[PDB]
Write an enzyme that holds these catalytic residues in place. Structure first.
Site: not given
Ligand SMILES: CCCCCCCCCCCCCCCCCC(=O)OCC(COC(=O)CCCCCCCCCCCCCCCCC)OC(=O)CCCCCCCCCCCCCCCCC
Ligand SMILES: CCCCCCCCCCCCCCCCCC(=O)OCC(COC(=O)CCCCCCCCCCCCCCCCC)OC(=O)CCCCCCCCCCCCCCCCC
Ligand code: HEA
Ligand code: HEA
Ligand SMILES: CCCCC/C=C\C/C=C\C/C=C\C/C=C\CCCC(=O)O[C@H](COC(=O)CCCCCCCCCCCCCCCCC)COP(=O)(O)OCCN
Ligand SMILES: CCCCC/C=C\C/C=C\C/C=C\C/C=C\CCCC(=O)O[C@H](COC(=O)CCCCCCCCCCCCCCCCC)COP(=O)(O)OCCN
Ligand SMILES: CCCCCC/C=C\CCCCCCCCCC(=O)O[C@H](COC(=O)CCCCCCCCCCCCCCC)COP(=O)(O)OC[C@@H](O)CO
Ligand SMILES: CCCCCC/C=C\CCCCCCCCCC(=O)O[C@H](COC(=O)CCCCCCCCCCCCCCC)COP(=O)(O)OC[C@@H](O)CO
Ligand SMILES: CCCCCC/C=C\CCCCCCCCCC(=O)O[C@H](COC(=O)CCCCCCCCCCCCCCC)COP(=O)(O)OC[C@@H](O)CO
Ligand SMILES: CCCCCCCCCCO[C@@H]1OC(CO)[C@@H](O[C@H]2O[C@@H](CO)[C@@H](O)[C@H](O)[C@@H]2O)[C@H](O)[C@H]1O
Ligand SMILES: C[C@H](CCC(=O)O)[C@H]1CC[C@@H]2[C@H]3[C@H](O)C[C@@H]4C[C@@H](O)CC[C@]4(C)[C@@H]3C[C@@H](O)[C@@]21C
Ligand SMILES: C[C@H](CCC(=O)O)[C@H]1CC[C@H]2[C@@H]3[C@H](O)C[C@@H]4C[C@H](O)CC[C@]4(C)[C@H]3C[C@H](O)[C@]12C
Ligand SMILES: C[C@H](CCC(=O)O)[C@H]1CC[C@H]2[C@@H]3[C@H](O)C[C@@H]4C[C@H](O)CC[C@]4(C)[C@H]3C[C@H](O)[C@]12C
Ligand code: CUA
Ligand SMILES: [Cu+2]
Ligand SMILES: [Mg+2]
Ligand code: NA
Ligand SMILES: [Zn+2]
Lengths: 46, 259, 227, 98, 58, 43, 84, 514, 79
Positions: H61, H91, H126, H156-157, H240, H290-291, H319, H438
């Site tokens: 997911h 282009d 993930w 790709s990215s 992050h 922080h993770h 913003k 989780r």
């Protein structure tokens, strides 16, 4: 060279709205169904 | 007719064959690692070589033969190569992070020391120093090659470029022999892991860089480069300097400080 | 434990958890205030036929909306950090207990004096005694002395797990090859529940933690009897 | 110590690369590599906008340092004015390739 | 060696409407067909392999 | 934004058909799998 | 630093060739002399089955699954010790 | 002709179209997976099986929503379509390499589907943390297929990032400075820079996991002197920046949508908006740990990461207030796109604020690995990123297709989705504060009410997704061709008509230097 | 004698959450001291403190594995 304009700058045809409905149904439907069938596949192995 | 200086590229099959070759190589690695078969991998490596050959062949056709590389197009290619090299630097940074993480806080399983108990590092003053002089030397000869090309000297450009390539090959041969002679392996804990994966990816880049230089050597033999337009050579040289700097960091970190 | 329809934190069992409750109340007020202020301003901007579509100057109102949030962040960071350092304070424990995470259960070791150790498994739903909680009860509870500073050391013998007891404000990851330390101190006797807090495979949802806090005297007899 | 044998752009440049090179030598900019310098932009002295057709998109940066660019099609014929600042522009069509 | 770039420039600028990857001649076509055949064939083979690996061989 | 009238108008009846078909394309396959879940779980 | 040489009046092809043959290659010749001198096979250490070395969590995808890629019998012992 | 156009493309519009199609299909897959998650949690007990099948679903997911839906749509789709038009470029800089960035996605997706088909799938989360993701706890090809999927998506990215950065720097009109480009273009370049720097670190990290799994290396295995925590650092160093990569193009589209429907010629405080995105991009590289507040790091390190993390609220705040300042005094057009943008502003703010709660390492001890984190990120992703995508989609659909959507149906779609996502995620805050972990396939009885309500909300969202498909069909079926669009003087992408011709800007725009 | 030990006290050398080296250090210290005493003709009772500390801190499986390795001759630490 290529066709241009509304309904011509896409890889699928929109000439017939019903054939289009069928295409979109298979396209989006196959995507949504895939996980359910993979879950089914995993359950039927063991 | 267009009235801007940019290149509108002819529809090409290479991006697709390139993407499929990636699928074949990863699927191939999986098949090899788990289903004891290299068939898929072989096909993937082959189509990948074919794709690269044709794609870059076409870039040469578009520039040297068709004249699509105006100054604006060339400026874009310069940014492209610089950006590519930056991403390669960050890739190596991950491996240096792994090296320093492990070596700066040796765990009890290693004996709580670095190098780990049972590991006998190569002498940095022997072949590793030689490798260092070899790459640094090739950095000087490639600069001579660049200046010769700019000064319109065909013979000396070829001579300097040949010397640069021979040095890259010498480094590769020396490294291959060092790998065979090393008393430690990739399976010898985190020492062997960090050593072989870092120097291994570096060796791969040396091979890629040498190949790029060889391409330039042959394009030069065929008079493709003018004294003023030769981006392929400039890119090969920037990439070569990158390979050289990565080695200096490996030498100082892994071979010298990490011994 | 959590009760049906619970909105906030489980009641604090340790002084540190009490400290976090007050800090959360403080922060949540700020969260409510700012989010409602934004909702309000959106509605304010959208409810008038009056217009002003020409260029508006920004270097003046940007000071306000840079300085204010900066001040608010500091008003959150101060008590946050005070609590952070408080949790790190040297306390000198009376007892040290170790817990090893395993693929699907926790083992405990009280090896200060005697070599006491046991496994702690979830009571299967089909075997629960009347009134017992599904997915939360264990066969062997972690008996510990109440009103005392205890040092808990956490590790794992296979994959990652995480040892948690919400009521006490605890959560320490169980990493193989590493010994993580945390301190526990219950202000009251009772049973306190927690659950494995790091995905560890097939039964990650089924390897709970149950602490049994009793007076020192009972803890000692229990220790002897458990040899 | 020295010699020759390496082609020059003058001898070997081709296609569009050669066109840009030769045009630049005559001080021309057929491939819009340079930013045009503004005239006073009055009714009498409009900004002359080259085009190979009968319309071209103009982007007007009304005042120096404006972050907003005003875009509009400039058509062959009477001079048009920027919708924002009113400076004049006039299309001067065709040619480029002889 | 002699400079034959001008010959190559003439060949690749020849107005025959061919895309650059086929403009060199008949060999381009052969190389292209070999590449694409290995790519598509290899992809079908990988799909077969996935089908095989998807099921347990107990 | 202004637009011209539909070149091939989709009447309310046509929309009900498209909406129904769309919803069914999502609901039926998943519903089938979910319904036979027990038959899968132990077989 | 500024090295210990000089030129700089105009660094061109002649100068870089001068550096290639007068500094770079001679350095490589010296290191090649030094290396093909301090070589000589060092006496392999006694084998000790340390648990942090000769790792095998999954067999290698080649050979008998127990030999590293550039396995050297003379210096690389298997998890069970040196080879015959 | 069909193959030449759609398989051998070197056109930025056609390639953007391929991306939008791919991302829409991926969104269906990701939605189905999210329904499987909520069906399992809809009532106490076990529906599918144990945590393995459950977590294979949770893992997929996440990968699908992030790598195959959000990134392809925002960057590959909107990015390719709009960036060249917004700077008047003919282009992208590397039109052929651009096509490979696209074609690497289907193979990447196939590898992800393969991993869930073989063995017992990759039920790792993930984040793919070892040892659970190692060759002992996850033996077999699954995790390796997942790593390879990430490698392809990564290449790709990275190539896409090089293309975007080069195009934006090198292909603007000679007179246009970087401070004269639209905010969406700025959002894409900054996003490209983050991709360029972060993905190679992830690549390094997952390659090390691959070697630990197959070549007997021990980077993360204590037995060889490795450390599982090293993987976490390498992953989150990328992780992050990745979340900012997911929201930045969203911020860009929101600026255009709010400006457009406020009847404004420009967003309020343009330079402050550029400053904010750059600051966010910068700060996003120095807060990763922080993770990892519960892994056992020194208190000073935790104090630093708590403080550095909070600072991001300042530029993000500029913003938010600038978007409100853009609405101020506007002739508000209550179009469906504006509704998505207004919902974005509020819901993203809520999610951002719960992120600030989580920044506090003290509190995070109790909130980490609980549903409070899930609530936070779904507010910024399933409400923030997704609302920006929906807003941008409805706004630009007429440009891309040449046809208009039915505004009433689009407003109905927004209403349903709004109720759905809020009913799904709001209750998760309660579940988190009260301690629900989780990645659990089942939960203690006390958590039943909120999990029941949350699963019901997820069905409401399913209804909105199905309606969306119908809406797109209705647009293409009725064929209401666009005539006129207002505000083209400050929205260059619309100036060439709907849809613009295959080749636009063959004759570049004229811009005086003065 | 000089004991009456409850548990291992705070050690300024290892003031952080990661206590892995604290356990390891005390295990090494005990076995080094034990070896010195058993060697030069002395009493292992002086090594007591280290034994109590490492026993309190170290996971049983770690101590057990380290002991097996010292016996096998594969203990990587220096004793
Ligand atoms: C997977 C594909 C489904 C197959 C269904 C096709 C059947 C063909 C019969 C064939 C009968 C012949 C009829 C011919 C003409 C029309 C049909 C068409 O041409 O046929 C194909 C065309 C068209 O696509 C369609 O067919 C209908 C799509 C309708 C889309 C409406 C989208 C609305 C959203 C707006 C998008 C932006 C446009 C707006 C702006 C306008 C653009 C400027 O596609 C393409 O050639 C390129 C698309 C490539 C990739 C997209 C996602 C795929 C992901 C797959 C990964 C799988 C991993 C393993 C996964 C394995 C599964 C387990
Ligand atoms: C569907 C969920 C049903 C839940 C029903 C609650 C039952 C109450 C029993 C009534 C029983 C009363 C006795 C209980 C007291 C215990 C207090 C405590 O110790 O526990 C403390 C807990 C409990 O929370 C509370 O102290 C109650 C706060 C409730 C806020 C409700 C907002 C509802 C909006 C309606 C739709 C939701 C989506 C809106 C989106 C809002 C985004 C958060 O605090 C939390 O951390 C939860 C909220 C966390 C994060 C959200 C922050 C941003 C809010 C934005 C507000 C926008 C308003 C505009 C107006 C909103 C316009 C849209
Ligand atoms: C679109 C994606 C996205 C974005 C933009 C963010 C943005 C933020 N995130 Fe979130 N986050 C995720 C996606 C995202 N996050 C994901 C996916 C995870 C979980 C990963 C996993 O484990 O799988 C996660 C996890 C996560 C954690 C780890 C929690 C844990 O695992 O225990 C933390 C920790 O600090 C955090 C913090 C923040 C903060 C402070 C912001 C800030 O950028 C927010 C800033 C915004 C605002 C504050 C609102 C607007 C501002 C104002 C109106 C001004 C005034 C405000 C103040 C004065 C405070 N996030
Ligand atoms: C962009 C990211 C994204 C999005 C949109 C979502 C959307 C949803 N997610 Fe999320 N989720 C994650 C990313 C995302 N999630 C991640 C990162 C994790 C953690 C994984 C882990 O723990 O390892 C997670 C975990 C996760 C959990 C926790 C699992 C657990 O801990 O056990 C739950 C539980 O309810 C959940 C539910 C849902 C639901 C019901 C939605 C619904 O809101 C979805 C509704 C449908 C949509 C919003 C998609 C619509 C978009 C399109 C279809 C494109 C349309 C086409 C065009 C416009 C061109 N998700
Ligand atoms: C196992 C190893 C294999 C790996 C080797 C790697 C790369 C080497 C490969 C090829 C290199 C050798 C020759 C290259 C091919 C053709 C060269 C011919 C050109 C020539 O003869 O050039 C002359 C230079 O001398 C020259 O080569 C001289 C070149 C030789 C230099 C090195 C010899 C060192 C001698 C001892 C000195 C050490 C003392 C140290 C001093 C301190 C240093 C600061 C100058 O002449 P010219 O009249 O101005 O020029 C007319 C145009 N050609
Ligand atoms: C001679 C110097 C040049 C180095 C490269 C040359 C030949 C090796 C083949 C491919 C290497 C390419 C990259 C490096 C990948 C892994 C490390 C390899 C470095 C190496 O060659 O290390 C060898 C190990 O070989 C091994 O396992 C090698 C086994 C080969 C398996 C390759 C597995 C490929 C895994 C690829 C993953 C690629 C992912 C790349 C992602 C890029 C970004 C997306 C060392 O040998 P040893 O016997 O253990 O010790 C010597 C004892 N006498
Ligand atoms: C350079 C920027 C400005 C500097 C400001 C600070 C930010 C980064 C600093 C980079 C260098 C820091 C190195 C100092 C080492 C001191 C810390 C140390 O000693 O950390 C070690 C690992 O450091 C390690 O690999 C550290 C390895 C790197 C980690 C940092 C991440 C940044 C790297 C990527 C940046 C990309 C830039 C591109 C470069 C060309 C080991 O872990 P400890 O936690 O100690 O465990 C000990 C426990 O047993 C007890 O608790
Ligand atoms: C046995 C070994 C096989 C291993 C696999 C990899 C093999 C080889 C990689 C080497 C790459 C060779 C690249 C050949 C490029 C030739 C095309 C070229 O160089 O094209 C030039 C443009 O540069 C361009 O696009 C520049 C193009 C940049 C390409 C460089 C990218 C390197 C690729 C790295 C890929 C692996 C990544 C690492 C894995 C972790 C053409 O312009 P000019 O030179 O100015 O000419 C015009 C004048 O003549 C006018 O008068
Ligand atoms: C096995 C495990 C995973 C495997 C993944 C494998 C993935 C792909 C493999 C096949 C790809 C090879 C095919 C050759 C690609 C060359 C791209 C190139 O050379 O692209 C160039 C642009 O990038 C430039 O210059 C500068 C940039 C050059 C980039 C070279 C591409 C290398 C691809 C690998 C990159 C890895 C990422 C590295 C970071 C870790 C040219 O741009 P075009 O649009 O073509 O033309 C524009 C025209 O005007 C030119 O006349
Ligand atoms: C999370 C996404 C899913 C949301 C929920 C789905 C909504 C409901 C969709 C309905 O789908 C079906 O319903 C059935 C029953 O109502 C099934 O019939 C089945 O049941 C029968 C009637 O009891 C039989 O007539 C047939 O054998 C039969 O297979 C059936 O196959 C399936 O297509
Ligand atoms: C043939 C060519 C002269 C220019 C021309 O092609 O007309 C000469 C000049 C310089 C080149 C040579 C350079 O002197 C460098 C090399 C030195 C030799 O030892 C081997 C071949 C060597 C690799 C080259 C081969 C040679 O055929 C080249 C290519
Ligand atoms: C100087 C620069 C650009 C101005 C211009 O050339 O137009 C402007 C753009 C955004 C401004 C920043 C943003 O407005 C945010 C901050 C606002 C405070 O009022 C001062 C510092 C503050 C950090 C500003 C400093 C400076 O004035 C910035 C950085
Ligand atoms: C987390 C990372 C180590 C990763 C690893 O163990 O591999 C380390 C390396 C250097 C550390 C930083 C440097 O030591 C400098 C700072 C020291 C302060 O005590 C805390 C913050 C501070 C900014 C550190 C934060 C964090 O612990 C860093 C960034
Ligand atoms: Cu143990 Cu989760
Ligand atoms: Cu983060
Ligand atoms: Mg965790
Ligand atoms: Na369940
Ligand atoms: Zn103007």
């Amino acid at each position: 060279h290529y066709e241009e304009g509304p309904g011509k700058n896409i890889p699928f045809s929109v000439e017939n709205k019903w054939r289009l409905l069928a295409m979109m149904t298979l396209f989006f439907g196959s995507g949504f169904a895939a996980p359910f069938f993979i879950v089914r596949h995993q359950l039927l192995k063991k | 007719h267009q009235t801007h200086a940019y290149h509108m590229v002819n529809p090409s099959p290479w991006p697709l064959t390139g993407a499929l070759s990636a699928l074949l190589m990863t699927s191939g690695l999986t098949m090899w690692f788990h289903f004891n078969s290299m068939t898929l991998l072989m096909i993937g490596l082959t189509t990948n070589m074919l794709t690269m050959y044709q794609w870059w062949r076409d870039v040469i056709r578009e520039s040297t033969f068709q004249g699509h590389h105006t100054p604006a197009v060339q400026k874009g290619l310069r940014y492209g190569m610089i950006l590519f090299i930056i991403s390669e630097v960050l890739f190596f940074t991950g491996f240096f992070w792994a090296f320093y993480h492990s070596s700066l806080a040796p765990t009890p399983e290693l004996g709580g020391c670095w190098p780990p108990t049972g590991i006998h590092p190569l002498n940095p003053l022997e072949v590793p120093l030689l490798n260092t002089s070899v790459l640094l030397a090739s950095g000087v000869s490639i600069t001579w090659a660049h200046h010769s090309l700019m000064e319109g000297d065909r013979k000396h450009m070829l001579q300097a470029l040949f010397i640069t390539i021979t040095l890259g090959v010498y480094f590769t041969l020396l490294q291959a022999s060092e790998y065979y002679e090393a008393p430690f392996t990739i399976s010898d804990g985190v020492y062997g892991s960090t050593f072989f994966v870092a120097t291994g990816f570096h060796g791969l880049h040396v091979i890629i860089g040498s190949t790029f230089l060889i391409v330039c050597f042959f394009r030069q033999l065929k008079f493709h480069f003018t004294s003023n337009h030769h981006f392929g050579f400039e890119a090969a040289a920037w990439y070569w300097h990158f390979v050289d700097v990565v080695w200096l960091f490996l030498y100082v970190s892994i071979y010298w400080w990490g011994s | 434990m959590a009760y049906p329809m619970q909105l906030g934190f489980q009641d604090a069992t340790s002084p540190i958890m009490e400290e976090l409750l007050h800090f959360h109340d403080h922060t949540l007020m700020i969260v409510f205030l700012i989010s409602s202020l934004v909702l309000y301003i959106i509605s304010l901007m959208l409810t008038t036929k009056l217009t002003h579509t020409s260029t508006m100057d920004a270097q003046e109102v940007e000071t306000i909306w840079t300085i204010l949030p900066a001040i608010i962040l500091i008003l959150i960071a101060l008590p946050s950090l005070r609590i952070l350092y408080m949790m790190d304070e040297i306390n000198n424990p009376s007892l040290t207990v170790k817990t090893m995470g395993h693929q699907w259960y926790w083992s405990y070791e009280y090896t200060d004096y005697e070599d006491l150790s046991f496994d702690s498994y979830m009571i299967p739903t089909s075997e629960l005694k009347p009134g017992e909680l599904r997915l939360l009860e264990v066969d062997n509870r972690v008996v510990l002395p109440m009103e005392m500073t205890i040092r808990m050391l956490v590790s794992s013998e296979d994959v990652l797990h995480s040892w948690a007891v919400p009521s006490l404000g605890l959560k320490t990851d169980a990493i193989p090859g590493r010994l993580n330390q945390t301190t526990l101190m219950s202000s009251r006797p009772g049973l306190y529940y927690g659950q494995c807090s790091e995905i560890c495979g097939s039964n990650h949802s089924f390897m709970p933690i149950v602490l049994e806090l009793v007076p020192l005297k009972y803890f000692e007899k229990w220790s002897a009897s458990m040899l | 110590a020295s010699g020759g044998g390496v082609p020059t752009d003058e001898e070997q440049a081709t296609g569009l690369e050669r066109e840009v090179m030769l045009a630049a030598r005559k001080g021309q900019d057929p491939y819009n590599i340079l930013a045009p310098k503004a005239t006073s932009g009055t009714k009498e002295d409009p900004n002359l906008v080259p085009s190979i057709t009968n319309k071209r998109i103009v982007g007007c940066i009304c005042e120096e340092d404006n972050s907003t660019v005003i875009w509009f099609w400039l058509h062959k014929g009477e001079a048009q004015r920027c919708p924002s600042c009113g400076t004049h522009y006039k299309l001067v069509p065709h040619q480029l390739a002889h | 060696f002699e400079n034959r770039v001008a010959e190559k420039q003439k060949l690749f600028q020849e107005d025959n409407g061919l895309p650059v990857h086929l403009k060199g001649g008949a060999t381009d076509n052969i190389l292209y067909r070999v590449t694409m055949t290995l790519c598509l064939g290899g992809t079908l083979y990988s799909l077969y392999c996935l089908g095989w690996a998807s099921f347990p061989h107990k | 934004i202004t637009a011209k009238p539909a070149k091939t108008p989709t009447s309310p009846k046509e929309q009900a058909i498209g909406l129904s078909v769309t919803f069914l394309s999502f609901l039926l396959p998943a519903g089938w799998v979910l319904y036979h879940l027990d038959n899968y779980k132990k077989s | 630093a500024s090295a210990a040489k000089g030129d700089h009046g105009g660094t061109g092809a002649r100068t870089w060739r001068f550096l290639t043959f007068g500094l770079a290659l001679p350095s490589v010749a010296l290191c090649t002399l030094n290396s093909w001198l301090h070589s000589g096979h060092r006496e392999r250490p006694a084998f000790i089955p340390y648990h942090h070395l000769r790792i095998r969590t999954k067999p290698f995808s080649w050979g008998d699954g127990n030999h590293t890629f550039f396995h050297n019998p003379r210096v690389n012992p298997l998890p069970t010790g040196y080879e015959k | 002709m069909f193959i030449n156009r759609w398989l051998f493309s070197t056109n930025h519009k056609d390639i953007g179209t391929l991306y939008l199609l791919f991302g829409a299909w991926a969104g269906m897959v990701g939605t189905a997976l999210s329904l499987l998650i909520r069906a399992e949690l809809g009532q106490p007990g076990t529906l599918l099986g144990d945590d393995q099948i459950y977590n294979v679903v949770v893992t997929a997911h996440a990968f699908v929503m992030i790598f195959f839906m959000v990134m392809p749509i925002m960057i590959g789709g909107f990015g390719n379509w709009l960036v060249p038009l917004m700077i008047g470029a003919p282009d992208m800089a590397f039109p052929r390499m651009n096509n490979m960035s696209f074609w690497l996605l289907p193979p990447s997706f196939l590898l992800l589907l393969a991993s869930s088909m073989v063995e017992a799938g990759a039920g790792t989360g993930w984040t793919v943390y070892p040892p659970l993701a190692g060759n002992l706890a996850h033996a077999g090809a699954s995790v390796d297929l997942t790593i390879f999927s990430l490698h392809l998506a990564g290449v790709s990215s990275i190539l896409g990032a090089i293309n975007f950065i080069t195009t934006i720097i090198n292909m603007k009109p000679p007179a246009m400075s970087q401070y004269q480009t639209p905010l969406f273009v700025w959002s894409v370049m900054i996003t490209a820079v983050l991709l360029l720097l972060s993905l190679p670190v992830l690549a390094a990290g997952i390659t090390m996991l691959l070697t630990d799994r197959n070549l007997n290396t021990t980077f993360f295995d204590p037995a060889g002197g490795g450390d599982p925590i090293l993987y976490q650092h390498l992953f989150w160093f990328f992780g992050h920046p990745e979340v900012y990569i997911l929201i930045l193009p969203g911020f860009g589209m929101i600026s255009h949508i709010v400006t457009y429907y406020s009847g404004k010629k420009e967003p309020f405080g343009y330079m402050g908006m550029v400053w904010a995105m750059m600051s966010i991009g910068f700060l996003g590289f120095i807060v990763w740990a922080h993770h990892m507040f519960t892994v056992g790091m020194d208190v000073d390190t935790r104090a630093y990461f708590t403080s550095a993390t909070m600072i991001i609220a300042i530029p993000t705040g500029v913003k938010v207030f600038s978007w409100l300042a853009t609405l101020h005094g506007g002739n508000i057009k209550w179009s469906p796109a504006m509704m998505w943008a207004l919902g974005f502003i509020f819901l993203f703010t809520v999610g951002g604020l719960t992120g600030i709660v989580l920044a506090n390492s003290s509190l995070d001890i109790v909130l980490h690995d609980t549903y409070y984190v899930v609530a936070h990120f779904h507010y910024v992703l399933s409400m923030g990123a997704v609302f920006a995508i929906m807003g941008g989609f409805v706004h630009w659909f007429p440009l891309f297709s040449g046809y208009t959507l039915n505004d009433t149906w689009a407003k109905i779609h927004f209403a349903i989705m709004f109720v759905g996502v809020n009913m799904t995620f709001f209750p998760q805050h309660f579940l988190g504060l009260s301690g629900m972990p989780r990645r659990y396939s089942d939960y203690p009885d006390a958590y039943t009410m909120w999990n029941t309500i949350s699963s019901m909300g997820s069905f409401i969202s399913l209804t909105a997704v199905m309606l969306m498909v119908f809406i797109i069909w209705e647009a293409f079926a009725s064929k209401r061709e666009v005539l006129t669009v207002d505000l083209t003087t400050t929205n260059l992408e619309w100036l060439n008509g709907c849809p613009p011709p295959y080749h636009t800007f063959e004759e570049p725009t004229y811009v005086n230097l003065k | 004698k000089i004991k009456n030990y409850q548990t291992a006290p705070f050690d300024s050398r290892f003031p952080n959450q990661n206590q892995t080296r604290n356990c390891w250090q005390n295990y090494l210290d005990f076995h080094r001291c034990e070896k010195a005493m058993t060697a030069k003709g002395g009493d292992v009772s002086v090594c007591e403190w280290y034994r109590r500390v490492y026993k309190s801190l170290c996971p049983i499986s770690w101590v057990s594995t380290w002991d097996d390795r010292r016996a096998e001759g594969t203990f990587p630490g220096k004793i």
